[model samples]
Target: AEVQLVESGGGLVQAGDSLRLSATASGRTFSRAVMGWFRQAPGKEREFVAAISAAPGTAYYAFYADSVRGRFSISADSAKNTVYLQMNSLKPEDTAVYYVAADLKMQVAAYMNQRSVDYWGQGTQVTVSS
Candidate 1:
């Protein structure tokens, strides 16, 4: 794999509190890396969190409902060899295993505008409660 990601600390968290996630990157090509964050919620399909670049480029964070859209955000750091996601006012529905996707744009579809992920992090599980 050209890239490797590992989820940082995660565990039981309280509702209404802020939630943060961290990940360490392989940095083999992080200097010019284009990465995306994705999550798999309980019994739900994969959802795009956001995409970021070390060059200060911003991609779009996939739209969820209004309640969630306002809470999700991301920050990237090549110098620190890390990337982070933060959600303000965590909700019970936010429980899921968050993952980081790498080298997503390297492989593309010929017939359409399609970019599939080839490598992903192990994921960090978080559960929010009252």
Candidate 2:
């Protein structure tokens, strides 16, 4: 029912500059939500990069973190009920499908729960053209 991964960009971005996407719930500074990053590729399975327990910022990073330079980031905005994740420093290897995952605070039981991405854009596609 609500959507806005980011109220606004904290800074400007240029080609090759690393950028992080963040969304916040407008008026509430406190929330018991969890967020994560997902990767989707053509003819490939969707993969999980990390799930952050906003409670304490507990999250996960893929084993590939060390293999690449400083080229990826993720963040959430509770204020706008939105979550975002990004990757820059575009090498040919950086091309792929990406998504932000968030736990929308609806749970039926312990482990038996339901979560949705409160906000999502009309699918932004990034491809390198030279």
Candidate 3:
């Protein structure tokens, strides 16, 4: 089964402000999906920002970049069938295209699954303007 991912969030943001991006999932239950968000600067390699194991009613782990450790977060609402990625304290360097991926593997733990982003969204372009 294919997992459908759609990303939303773009336009401009002022430095030091906060921004939010969303990715809606369908075609499969997200309760056991390994979801990740990635960012890419123009002509640069994609950087993994964060990921979450969205297993309903079970303990899950989230990972984030050191720079975005406190200012960034990811959440999933199974009832709504959506996942969210939030960023705080924007900066010019933060301007980039963001993508969402889902590894539809029902692994007990995400880290040990050795799975990669099998599905990707078109991407959302975000710019930081002064």
Candidate 4:
């Protein structure tokens, strides 16, 4: 299976640009999968952000969303099989590996998607500097 990203508008995204991420599967329904996003900074390990349920529109935020870490949000469009992670206040430190992950099983008691992220996007890295 393959995933493709199509921006709502067509152009190179600069800093402060509102980027919308749209994804499509080659031959999969992706109806029962849980989607998530993460960040892997340059020369650093990956960090988990947020995840969303495809059917109920239920979201689980990480970091500030909980009693630990920072704050982030994840939203999904089941109709189009697309998921989004929006970082409103962009900072140079925000630059990192923004990846899309998927899990076939959504087990609350289980360790993340009941296994590992089955798939991932190429990732979009945003750098802030003059």
Which portions of model 1 miss their true places by more than 4 Å? 26-29, 56-67, 106-115
For each candidate, what is the lDDT? 0.67, 0.45, 0.75, 0.52
Which of candidates 2 and 4 reaches a greater TM-score? 4
Clashing pairs in 4: 64-70
> Cα RMSD for candidate 3?
3.0
Over the stretch 1-130, how does candidate 2's per-residue lDDT look in tens digits? 5544322333333456555545454443335555555444588655554444443344332222342425565544544555655566754444445554445663211121113444332333344332
lDDT of 4 at 108: 30
TM match of model 1 to true structure: 0.75
Report residue 21 deviation for candidate 2 (angstroms).
4.1
Error of 4 at 87 (Å): 1.5
| By lDDT: ranked, best first | 3, 1, 4, 2
Candidate 3 structure quality by residue, lDDT tens digits, 1-130: 6666889977689999888899886565455677788888878877778788745464566877665677888887767777788888888888899888776663532332223667888889989986
CA shift of 122, model 2, Å = 6.7
TM-score against native, each model: 0.75, 0.49, 0.83, 0.64
Residues 1-130, candidate 1: write the lDDT tens digits: 4666788867889998887888886556454555666777867877666665543254322223344567877776655878788778888877888887765454321111114666688999988997
Task: Name the lDDT of candidate 1.
Answer: 0.67
TM-score of 4: 0.64
Model 4 alpha-carbon miss at residue 68, Å: 10
Model 3 misplaced regions, further than 4 Å: 26-29, 55-59, 105-115
Q: What digit string (tens of lDDT, one per residue) describes model 4 on residues 1-130?
A: 6644322212244455444444445565565666666557667766655666534345433222231134344566665666666555444555655666666556331224313777766676655441
Top model number, TM-score: 3
- Stronger candidate by lDDT (3 vs 4): 3
- In terms of lDDT, model 3 sits at 0.75
Question: lDDT of candidate 4 vs native?
Answer: 0.52
